[PDB]
């Protein structure tokens, strides 16, 4: 079971060398995507009953 | 046009099949068999088996269909496979009553902890438990002129006395009766602590030779269903 | 004088309103929610429907007849009113008998309850009960087989403003036997068996576990047998006695006991709908 | 020397935590504060599907947003038709316990598994068993069709695998989890997938490389469900402590948490919308809740089920949302 321990160390070593970006840029990207695709969400915007397939 | 008729015909056939299957679904009764390791769970099923990742066993008693589902191959200290068993009629618990000396901690203490965890589970609040206390004659041999004593492993035995309502089997010394009733009361204390009147326990004493295990289970299931019906109408 | 006639209208209207409201609330609560759609709940639905029909049909007309002291409708309408009374009264008891039998089967036959009772069979039973109840009301009242023979009855029949209850011995015995006496022994036997089973189970539990750890059975059985017995017992005795020998029971006592029988209508929802699911349903709407 | 290795591991965790903390320039709520809220949202039931004799655990919408599949504990899979609320198929099972179901992207194959450690696949158009995949040592929890000729599965033995339908033999096995794995989700491009284990940890895997890339340990209890952002650079998880957290692949830490003080029940399902603005999560309180992704503000409640909700899904076109409950009823909300 001690043999296991070196394998863990390699995994943490490989998972620590990752380039990261500031959270502000990621929040801005999420904001931009949500704003851009905000006009094509039937759940968000109540569509007229003419195009609604579940209106009986 | 004909597509609607074809879909209606398919729906009618499916409804007929479901209506046919509903009766056989409601007819059968489902039981769960859980035990700790070294219990004897395996020996008990085959005698029941000899008579009429998972294991299923079918046996009919007085034109009533019972189905038993051993869960095995998944040894988990934490069980998440237990949320699926809230609709079973009863739970069969098998414990090795003669193994209080065997050290893994103790086996009997581990079985008691498992029973306590099962009893207080959130999804099993309305499920009764049938208890089988296996290995009767091993316990008798250990108690009668045995070097090992219950006093060393279980200290509160010392203050325990034989109940006045006990009915000891003929031809046995008082010592084995005391040990058996002490273990049964040890289980019944946890059974009673949080009973709340919704589900009970049915202790029993058995051995490899006994063939009455089939009749007992039937009687206990009938009693459980009758008690549930009585409580539903506010009569108990 | 006027003040005394002035008073009973308020209480009679309150009785009518309570009778209507209770059964309409039970009916809408059962219909609205799909979780209460149970086999044992169909008999209660039939009972509520019959009780609501009776409370909306016979009670106001009897109130108007008592207050006005003169029947201002036609003879056909009075006969229809009497038929409605007989039909509803007969149908309001056999449903209780069916409920008692269903509980007996559920408790004493736990392994065969599911197979014996089916949603299709309950409808057949309900229609059979309703058709036998309507066979003993409309069929012998539209025809003149119930009519008496003495001169007072004929004089009242001739007049278009008088219609009381006059009948011979045969109908007065047959209707009572069909409506009340027969569905009584069955209920008594069923509830005695249920009480015996409950006592046996309680004794078994006490013997098995009582060291670490009656009043309940009696109370439920009691609030069930006594309400119905006290409500419907005296009337179905005076019905026989005043016919078996005349000049014993005055009209006032007969009417008073008959109206005492009607008060049983407002108690069935308070007895058969006390389950926690019903409380949740009642709290869900109009609360 | 084991203690020295443990010391080296302890040191690495601190460096990773410091690196994650160094990137916390500003909170998500601070950035998204001037956006007008979407306001209250209201939904009403449009269809109700009946025919299941027992409780329902899983369901999966079709690729055409018309058909759907559902599996119950009576031992049956039923393929519905939401437009005409009528059934098309009813497949019996050898084992009556099923915990997951899936629908092929091409609409040709259907798979399901349960307590028995076997994943079975049915050919819809030929309905008989086509292939049985075995080799797992624990109960299956979730499975998803990566394509028409290969499937990815997770089981209760702390592993995930990528099967091959034609051969029936395991191709790549992912290890590293400590507790049972209950859910997984795939990226739209089918290059990476995430898994949520019972040790309060979520990981990001590589299908082709067969190695782990990142590890997220935001939660403190069991993780039951997981969903993936439409953009492809975020995902959300739901745990037993009545909390939902939105993580981030590029930032490598959580950004927002969803919780309220009046709920103490568990969470069983999580899903997004087409635009990603709405977070839909099912609870153990017999109903559903609709959150706001960029504001953590409640915007609606989906009630109508008499028992706990154990399934949730949104169609590809995003026109309706369907929920499953232990009351043996399926509902369509719009
Ligand atoms: N004296 C006695 N010995 C028994 C009895 N039942 C079983 N044994 C013995 O104890 C053993 C334990 O039962 P097993 O056959 O191992 O059953 P199992 O299902 O593998 O046991 P678990 O590990 O508890 O799941 C049996 O194989 C027998 O050797 C019994 O009634 N009396
Ligand atoms: C005057 N009203 C009637 C009189 C006779 C009668 C009633 C009810 C049930 C019966 O079996 C009867 O015979 C009463 O409702």
Swiss-Prot record, chain A:
The principal localisation class reads membrane
Tell me one GO molecular function of this protein. G-protein beta-subunit binding
Tissue localization of expression: Expressed in fetal tissues, including testis, adrenal gland, brain, white blood cells and brain.
- Secretion signal, residue range per the UniProt entry: none
Q: Which UniProt keywords apply?
A: Acetylation, Cell membrane, Host-virus interaction, Lipoprotein, Membrane, Methylation, Prenylation, Transducer
Q: Write out the GO cellular component annotations.
A: extracellular exosome; heterotrimeric G-protein complex; membrane; plasma membrane; synapse
| Compartments, record wording | Cell membrane
Protein origin, superkingdom: Eukaryota
Gene Ontology annotations of biological process type: adenylate cyclase-activating dopamine receptor signaling pathway; cellular response to catecholamine stimulus; cellular response to prostaglandin E stimulus; fibroblast proliferation; G protein-coupled receptor signaling pathway
Membrane topology per the entry is: Lipid-anchor
Provide the function of this protein. Guanine nucleotide-binding proteins (G proteins) are involved as a modulator or transducer in various transmembrane signaling systems. The beta and gamma chains are required for the GTPase activity, for replacement of GDP by GTP, and for G protein-effector interaction.
The entry sums up its family as follows: Belongs to the G protein gamma family.
> What is this protein identified as?
Guanine nucleotide-binding protein G(I)/G(S)/G(O) subunit gamma-2
Query: Can you name the source organism?
Result: Homo sapiens (Human)
Q: What does UniProt list as this organism's lineage?
A: Eukaryota, Metazoa, Chordata, Craniata, Vertebrata
Q: Which gene encodes it?
A: GNG2
From Swiss-Prot, chain B:
Enzyme class name: hydrolase
The record gives the effect of mutating residue 97 to R as: In AHO; may alter guanine nucleotide binding which could lead to thermolability and impaired function
Crosslink site: Glycyl lysine isopeptide (Lys-Gly) (interchain with G-Cter in ubiquitin): 142
Question: Where found, per UniProt?
Answer: Cell membrane
Quote the biased-composition stretches of kind Basic and acidic residues, using this chain's numbering.
1-11
Q: Which CDD domains match?
A: G-alpha
One GO cellular component term of this record is: cytoplasm
Q: Does the keyword Iron-sulfur apply?
A: no
Q: Per the record, which residues fall in region G1 motif? A: 30-43
Annotated region (G4 motif), positions in chain? 130-137
Q: What is the effect of changing residue 74 to L?
A: Increases binding to GAS2L2
Q: Tell me the impact of changing residue 74 to H.
A: In pituitary adenomas; also found in a patient with severe Cushing syndrome
Give the Gene Ontology MF terms in alphabetical order: adenylate cyclase activator activity; D1 dopamine receptor binding; G protein activity; G-protein beta/gamma-subunit complex binding; GTP binding; GTPase activity; metal ion binding
Modification Phosphoserine occurs at: 194
Q: Which SUPFAM superfamilies match?
A: P-loop containing nucleoside triphosphate hydrolases (SSF52540), Transducin (alpha subunit), insertion domain (SSF47895)
- UniProt KW keywords: ADP-ribosylation, Cell membrane, Cushing syndrome, Disease variant, Dwarfism, GTP-binding, Hydrolase, Isopeptide bond, Lipoprotein, Magnesium, Membrane, Metal-binding, Nucleotide-binding, Obesity, Palmitate, Phosphoprotein, Proto-oncogene, Transducer, Ubl conjugation
Tell me the segments the record calls region G3 motif.
66-75
List the PANTHER family.
Answer: GTP-BINDING PROTEIN ALPHA SUBUNIT (PTHR10218), GUANINE NUCLEOTIDE-BINDING PROTEIN G(S) SUBUNIT ALPHA (PTHR10218:SF357)
Q: What is this protein called?
A: Guanine nucleotide-binding protein G(s) subunit alpha isoforms short
Swiss-Prot record, chain C:
- Lipid attachment residues per UniProt (S-palmitoyl cysteine): 287
* Parts of the chain that traverse the membrane: 7-30, 44-67, 79-101, 123-146, 169-192, 221-244, 252-275
Q: What happens upon changing residue 113 to F?
A: Abolishes insulin-induced tyrosine phosphorylation and insulin-induced receptor supersensitization
Ranges in the topological domain labelled Cytoplasmic: 31-43, 102-122
GO CC annotation terms, alphabetical:
apical plasma membrane; ciliary basal body; cilium; clathrin-coated endocytic vesicle membrane; early endosome; endosome; endosome membrane; Golgi apparatus
Instruction: Print the keywords alphabetically.
Output: Cell membrane, Disulfide bond, Endosome, G-protein coupled receptor, Glycoprotein, Golgi apparatus, Hydroxylation, Lipoprotein, Membrane, Palmitate, Phosphoprotein, Receptor, Transducer, Transmembrane, Transmembrane helix, Ubl conjugation
Q: Where does (S)-carazolol bind?
A: 85, 175, 258
Q: What is the recorded post-translational modification?
A: Palmitoylated. Mainly palmitoylated at Cys-287. Palmitoylation may reduce accessibility of phosphorylation sites by anchoring the receptor to the plasma membrane. Could be depalmitoylated by LYPLA1 at the plasma membrane. Phosphorylated by PKA and BARK upon agonist stimulation, which mediates homologous desensitization of the receptor. PKA-mediated phosphorylation seems to facilitate phosphorylation by BARK.
What is the recorded membrane topology of this protein? Answer: Multi-pass membrane protein
Q: Which parts of the sequence carry Phosphotyrosine? A: 113
- The residues that hold (S)-timolol are 85, 90, 239, 258, 262
Q: Could you tell me which residue ranges are on the Extracellular side of the membrane?
A: 68-78, 147-168, 245-251
- SS bond partners: 78-163, 156-162
Question: Which cellular compartments is it found in?
Answer: Cell membrane; Early endosome; Golgi apparatus
Q: Which family does it belong to?
A: Belongs to the G-protein coupled receptor 1 family. Adrenergic receptor subfamily. ADRB2 sub-subfamily.
Shown residues in whole-protein numbering: 29 to 341 of 413
Swiss-Prot record, chain D:
Q: Which GO terms describe its cellular component?
A: cytoplasm; cytosol; extracellular exosome; extracellular vesicle; heterotrimeric G-protein complex; lysosomal membrane; membrane; photoreceptor disc membrane
Q: Changing residue 116 to G: what effect?
A: In MRD42; decreases receptor-driven G protein activation; no effect on protein abundance; no effect on complex formation with gamma subunit; no effect on trimer formation with alpha and gamma subunits
Provide the record's note on post-translational modification.
Answer: Phosphorylation at His-260 by NDKB contributes to G protein activation by increasing the high energetic phosphate transfer onto GDP.
Q: Does the keyword Amino-acid biosynthesis apply?
A: no
Q: Which PROSITE patterns match?
A: WD_REPEATS_1, WD_REPEATS_2, WD_REPEATS_REGION
Phosphohistidine PTM sites in chain numbering: 260
UniProt cross-references to Pfam families, sorted A to Z: WD40_Gbeta
Is Magnesium included in the keywords of this UniProt record?
Answer: no
Q: In which domain of life is the source organism classified? A: Eukaryota
> Keywords of this protein's UniProt record, alphabetized?
Acetylation, Disease variant, Host-virus interaction, Intellectual disability, Phosphoprotein, Repeat, Transducer, WD repeat
Q: Which residues form a coiled coil?
A: none
Q: What GO terms in the biological process aspect are recorded for it?
A: adenylate cyclase-activating dopamine receptor signaling pathway; cell population proliferation; cellular response to catecholamine stimulus; cellular response to prostaglandin E stimulus; G protein-coupled acetylcholine receptor signaling pathway; G protein-coupled receptor signaling pathway; phospholipase C-activating G protein-coupled receptor signaling pathway; Ras protein signal transduction
Spell out the residue ranges that the record assigns to WD repeats.
44-92, 93-134, 135-175, 176-217, 218-261, 262-303, 304-334
> What PANTHER family does this protein's entry cite?
GUANINE NUCLEOTIDE-BINDING PROTEIN BETA G PROTEIN BETA
Gene of this entry: GNB1
């Amino acid at each position: 079971s001690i043999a296991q321990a070196r394998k863990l160390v390699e995994q943490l070593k490989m998972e620590a060398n990752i380039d990261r970006i500031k959270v502000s840029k990621a929040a801005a990207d999420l904001m931009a995507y949500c704003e851009a695709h905000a006009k094509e969400d039937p759940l968000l915007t109540p569509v007229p009953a003419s195009e609604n397939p579940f209106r009986e | 046009r004909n597509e609607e008729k074809a879909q209606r015909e398919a729906n009618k056939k499916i409804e007929k099949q479901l209506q046919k299957d509903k009766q056989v679904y409601r007819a059968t009764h489902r039981l769960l068999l859980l035990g700790a390791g070294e219990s004897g769970k395996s020996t008990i099923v085959k005698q029941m088996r000899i008579l009429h990742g998972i294991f299923e066993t079918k046996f009919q008693v007085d034109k009533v269909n019972f189905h038993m589902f051993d869960v095995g191959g998944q040894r988990d200290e934490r069980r998440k496979w237990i949320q699926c068993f809230n609709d079973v009629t009863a739970i069969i618990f098998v414990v090795a009553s003669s193994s209080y000396n065997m050290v893994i901690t103790n086996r009997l203490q581990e079985a008691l902890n498992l029973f306590k965890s099962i009893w207080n589970n959130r999804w099993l609040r309305t499920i009764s438990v049938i208890l089988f206390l296996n290995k009767q004659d091993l316990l008798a041999e250990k108690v009668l002129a045995g070097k090992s004593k219950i006093e060393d492993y279980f200290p509160e035995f010392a203050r325990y006395t034989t109940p006045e309502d006990a009915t000891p089997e003929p031809g046995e010394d008082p010592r084995v009766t005391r040990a058996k009733y002490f273990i049964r009361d040890e289980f019944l204390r946890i059974s009673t602590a949080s009973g709340d009147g919704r589900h009970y326990c049915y202790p029993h004493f058995t051995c490899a030779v006994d063939t009455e295990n089939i009749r007992r289970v039937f009687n206990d299931c009938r009693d459980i269903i009758q008690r549930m019906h009585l409580r539903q109408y506010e009569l108990l | 004088d006027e003040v005394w006639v002035v008073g009973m209208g308020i209480v009679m209207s309150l009785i009518v309103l309570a009778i209507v409201f209770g059964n309409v609330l039970v009916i809408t609560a059962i219909a609205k929610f799909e979780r209460l759609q149970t086999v044992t709940n169909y008999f209660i639905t039939s009972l509520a429907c019959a009780d609501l029909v009776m409370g909306l049909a016979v009670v106001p007309f009897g109130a108007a007849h008592i207050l006005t002291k003169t029947w201002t409708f036609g003879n056909f309408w009075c006969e229809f009113w009497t038929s409605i009374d007989v039909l509803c009264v007969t149908a309001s008891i056999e449903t209780l008998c069916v409920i008692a039998v269903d509980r007996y089967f559920a408790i004493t036959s736990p392994f065969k309850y599911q197979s014996l009772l089916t949603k299709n069979k309950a409808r057949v039973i309900i229609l059979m009960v309703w058709i036998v109840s309507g066979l003993t009301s409309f069929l012998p009242i539209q025809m003149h087989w119930y009519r008496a023979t003495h001169q007072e009855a004929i004089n009242c029949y001739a007049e278009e403003t008088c219609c009381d209850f006059f009948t011979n011995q045969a109908y007065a015995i047959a209707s009572s036997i069909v409506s009340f006496y027969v569905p009584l022994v069955i209920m008594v036997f069923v509830y005695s068996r249920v009480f015996q089973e409950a006592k046996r189970q309680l004794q078994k539990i006490d013997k098995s576990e009582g060291r670490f750890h009656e009043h309940k059975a009696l109370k439920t059985l009691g609030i069930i047998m006594g309400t119905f017995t006290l409500c419907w017992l005296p009337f179905f005795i005076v019905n026989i006695v005043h016919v078996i020998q005349d000049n014993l029971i005055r009209k006032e006592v007969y009417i008073l006991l008959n109206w005492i029988g009607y008060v049983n209508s407002g108690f069935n929802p308070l007895i058969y709908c006390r389950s926690p699911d019903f409380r949740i349903a009642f709290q869900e709407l109009l609360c | 020397e084991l203690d020295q290795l443990r010391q080296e591991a302890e040191q690495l965790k601190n460096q990773i935590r410091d690196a994650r903390k160094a990137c916390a320039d500003a909170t998500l709520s601070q950035i998204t504060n001037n956006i007008d809220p979407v306001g209250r949202i209201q939904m009403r039931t449009r269809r109700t599907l009946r025919g299941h004799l027992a409780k329902i655990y899983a369901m999966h919408w079709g690729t055409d947003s018309r058909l759907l599949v559902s599996a119950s504990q009576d031992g049956k899979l039923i393929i519905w038709d939401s437009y005409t609320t009528n059934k098309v198929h009813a497949i019996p099972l050898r084992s009556s316990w099923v915990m997951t179901c899936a629908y092929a992207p091409s609409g040709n194959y259907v798979a399901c598994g349960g307590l028995d450690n076997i994943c079975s696949i049915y050919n819809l158009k030929t309905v008989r068993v086509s292939r049985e995949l075995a080799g797992h040592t624990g109960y299956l929890s979730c499975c998803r069709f990566l394509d028409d000729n290969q499937i990815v599965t997770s089981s209760g033995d702390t592993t995930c695998a990528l099967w091959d339908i034609e051969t029936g033999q395991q191709t790549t096995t992912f290890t590293g989890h400590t507790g049972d794995v209950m859910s997984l989700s795939l990226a739209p491009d089918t290059r990476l997938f995430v898994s949520g284990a019972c040790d309060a940890s979520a990981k990001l895997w590589d299908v082709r490389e067969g190695m782990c890339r990142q590890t997220f340990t935001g939660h403190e209890s069991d993780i039951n469900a997981i969903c993936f952002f439409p953009n492809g650079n975020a995902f959300a998880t739901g745990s037993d402590d009545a909390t939902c957290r939105l993580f981030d692949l590029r930032a490598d830490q959580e950004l927002m948490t969803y919780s309220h003080d009046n709920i103490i029940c568990g969470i069983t399902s999580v899903s997004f919308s087409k635009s990603g603005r709405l977070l839909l999560a099912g609870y153990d309180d017999f109903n559903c809740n609709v959150w706001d992704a960029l504001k953590a503000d409640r915007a609606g409640v989906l009630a109508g089920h008499d028992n706990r909700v154990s399934c949730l899904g949104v169609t590809d076109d995003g026109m309706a949302v369907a929920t499953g409950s232990w009351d043996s009823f399926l509902k369509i909300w719009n």
